[PDB]
Amino acid sequence: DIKRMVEDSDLQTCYCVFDVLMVNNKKLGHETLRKRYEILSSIFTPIPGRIEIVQKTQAHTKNEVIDALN
DNA sequence: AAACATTCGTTCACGTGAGTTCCAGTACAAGTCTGGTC
């Protein structure tokens, strides 16, 4: 039940962010994914266990996709 | 001088390419039903 955390449970809630759509009266929804990913590193400094940024890896072949799936 | 062969413009039938209407296959999106736990 991440849907409803229990107080006695040892595990806690974590937020893995993979997009930003607005920062300081600047609308990022019409921008490219590259620029939003770049901006996402200038909003918060992640602290493991509570808030994090999902890692994206560059790839330009099908074999890379298959290796990641495996 | 008379008979037969050849040629010519005409005619019909049959075949092939391009335009138009109708329907089947495909794609995508939304709706509906179901499963599991906490």
Report how far residue A58's alpha carbon sits from residue A21's, in angstroms, rounded to the nearest whole number.
Answer: 22
Burial readout A1-40 (b: 16 or more C-beta within 10 A, e: otherwise): eeeeeeeeeeeeeeeeeeebeeeeeeeeeeeeeeebeeeb
Nearest nucleotide by C1' position to the A1 CA atom: B38
Instruction: Count CB neighbours of A53 within 10 A.
Output: 15
Q: How many residues make up chain A in this entry? A: 70
List residues bridging with A27 in a β-sheet. A22
Per-position DSSP letters for A1-50, written without gaps between them: --SS--TT-S----EEE----BSSS-B-TTS-HHHHHHHHTTT---BTTT
Tell the burial category of A52 from Cβ atoms under 10 Å away from its Cβ (0-12, 13-18, 19+).
middle
Q: Which nucleotides of B are covered by protein (CB under 7 A)?
A: 37-38
Nearest nucleotide by C1' position to the A6 CA atom: B38
CA of A68 to C1' of B23 (A): 46
- Strand B–CB A4 distance below 7 A: yes
